[PDB]
Amino acid sequence: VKSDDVNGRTKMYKNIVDGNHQMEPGMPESFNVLLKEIRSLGINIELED
Amino acid sequence: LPVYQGETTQTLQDYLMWQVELTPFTDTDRAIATSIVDAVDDTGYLTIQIEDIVDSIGDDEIGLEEVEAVLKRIQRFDPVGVAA
Amino acid sequence: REELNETNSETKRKKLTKRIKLLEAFVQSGNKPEWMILTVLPVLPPDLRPL
C-alpha cells in the first residue's frame, strides 16, 4: 500500500469501504514492469510456479 | 518517469472512469460505464451514444436497457452531468 | 579438461579451469551463444518513456 502506484489504490479503497481489508500479492507491480523490461522480456526464464 | 499525467481526482474523463472503477459493479456494468466515459467529447457529454457502442461491440448481451442503467449509474458521479 | 589434468602449475591451474567451468555451464545452459550480439531489440512502451 504505502507508496505510489495508485493502480491498486482503487482496490484498496473498495475493500476498505466494503470493510474487506484485503489485498492481492500480485507482483512488485514495478517488477512486473521490470519484466516489461527483461531486456524487453529478453530474460523471461521466469519459471512461475 | 515511466509515463506522465495531469490533474487527478479531477482526473478528467479518466476521473469519471475511475469513479466508475471506484464503485461496485460487474464486468458488464464497468464495461458499459467505460464505453460511456471513453465516448465523451471535449464538451463533457457522451460523445458516442449507446447505439454506437452497441454497434461497435456487436454484443447482444450488452443491451439498451443495461447500457442505459450503467450510464445512469454514471450520470452524476464526478462531476454531476458527465457523459451527458 | 585435458590441459588442466596434464598441464599443472601455479599459473596453469588458473585461467583455464575457469574457462572449462564456463563452457560446462553454457552447455548446461544450452542457449545459442550468438545471443551476445542479438537480432531483435526492446523498444520502450509509451508508458515506459516519459516527457
UniProtKB/Swiss-Prot annotation, chain A:
Official protein name in the record: DNA-directed RNA polymerase subunit beta
Post-translational modification: Acetylated on several lysine residues in the presence of glucose.
Family, per entry: Belongs to the RNA polymerase beta chain family.
Function: DNA-dependent RNA polymerase (RNAP) catalyzes the transcription of DNA into RNA using the four ribonucleoside triphosphates as substrates. Resistance to the antibiotics salinamide A, salinamide B, rifampicin, streptolydigin, CBR703, myxopyronin, and lipiarmycin can result from mutations in this protein.
Organism: Escherichia coli (strain K12)
Full protein stretch here: 1293 to 1341 of 1342
Biotech exploitation of the protein: Co-administration of salinamide and rifampicin or salinamide and myxopyronin suppresses the emergence of resistance to both antibiotics.
Subunit text: The RNAP catalytic core consists of 2 alpha, 1 beta, 1 beta' and 1 omega subunit. When a sigma factor is associated with the core the holoenzyme is formed, which can initiate transcription. The rRNA transcription and antitermination complex (rrnTAC) consists of RNAP, NusA, NusB, NusE (rpsJ), NusG, SubB, ribosomal protein S4, DNA and precursor rRNA; S4 is more flexible than other subunits. In pull-down experiments interacts with CedA. (Microbial infection) Interacts (via flap domain) with Escherichia phage lambda antitermination protein Q; this interaction renders bacterial RNAP resistant to transcription pausing and allows it to read through termination signals.
Coiled coil location: none
UniProtKB/Swiss-Prot annotation, chain C:
Biotechnology: Co-administration of salinamide and rifampicin or salinamide and myxopyronin suppresses the emergence of resistance to both antibiotics.
Domain of life, source organism: Bacteria
Entry comment on modification after translation: Acetylated on several lysine residues in the presence of glucose.
Role noted for this protein: DNA-dependent RNA polymerase (RNAP) catalyzes the transcription of DNA into RNA using the four ribonucleoside triphosphates as substrates. Resistance to the antibiotics salinamide A, salinamide B, rifampicin, streptolydigin, CBR703, myxopyronin, and lipiarmycin can result from mutations in this protein.
Assembly with partners or alone: The RNAP catalytic core consists of 2 alpha, 1 beta, 1 beta' and 1 omega subunit. When a sigma factor is associated with the core the holoenzyme is formed, which can initiate transcription. The rRNA transcription and antitermination complex (rrnTAC) consists of RNAP, NusA, NusB, NusE (rpsJ), NusG, SubB, ribosomal protein S4, DNA and precursor rRNA; S4 is more flexible than other subunits.
Family recorded in the similarity comment: Belongs to the RNA polymerase beta' chain family.
The protein's name in its UniProt record: DNA-directed RNA polymerase subunit beta'
Organism: Escherichia coli (strain K12)
First and last residues shown, out of full length: 202 to 252 of 1407
